[PDB]
Write a protein that binds this ligand. Structure first.
Ligand code: HEM
Length: 154
């Protein structure tokens, strides 16, 4: 698939807002993922022990990881589809070290859309959400194709 320039503009316009507070958005998103799909928490040996949202909010370690996740995703989005090289080392770690099924990448995609919709309603109307959704679908498809080349396709 290919996003048009106007689609990339809607994505990067809301992303610019997100970047005013990377740590707070990172936290909101991981917590939304873990609350909505608790099975995903099981993949993190680092956070497996957290029992409530309160504990999650208080974890500086979780917040640090949120920053890491959104910084990597932001570097990919800013490539506007030219992300081949950037994708490769994360596809390999997520496929053979962490073992993350594509299903779970769909789950964090939903969490991202939820949080942006809640925090940026004026910049995240139907057209901007449609563009972000296509950008995340592009990302998942390319990561799925890499998974296949690497032997996981899990
Ligand atoms: C937008 C999707 C995602 C991005 C951009 C992302 C990015 C990253 C980055 C940059 C790291 C650190 C370096 C590395 O190990 O590659 C990481 C580690 C990790 N990711 Fe992801 N990730 C994503 C989705 C997920 C999902 C959905 C899960 C699991 C449900 C997951 C599980 C992990 C685990 C287990 C680690 C290692 C945590 C530790 O430090 O112990 N990731 N991720």
């Amino acid at each position: 698939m290919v996003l048009s320039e106007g689609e990339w503009q809607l994505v990067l316009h809301v992303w610019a807002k997100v970047e005013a507070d990377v740590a707070g958005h990172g936290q909101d998103i991981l917590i939304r993922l873990f609350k909505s799909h608790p099975e995903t928490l099981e993949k993190f040996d680092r956070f497996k022990h957290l029992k409530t949202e309160a504990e999650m909010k208080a974890s500086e370690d979780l917040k640090k990881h949120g920053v890491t996740v959104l910084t990597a995703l932001g570097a990919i989005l800013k490539k506007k589809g030219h992300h081949e090289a950037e994708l490769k080392p994360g596809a390999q770690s997520h496929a053979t070290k962490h073992k993350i099924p594509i299903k779970y990448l769909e789950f964090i995609s939903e969490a991202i859309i939820h949080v942006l919709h809640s925090r940026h309603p004026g910049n995240f109307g139907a057209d901007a959400q449609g563009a972000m959704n296509k950008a995340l679908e592009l990302f998942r498809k390319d990561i799925a194709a890499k998974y296949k080349e690497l032997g996981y396709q899990g």
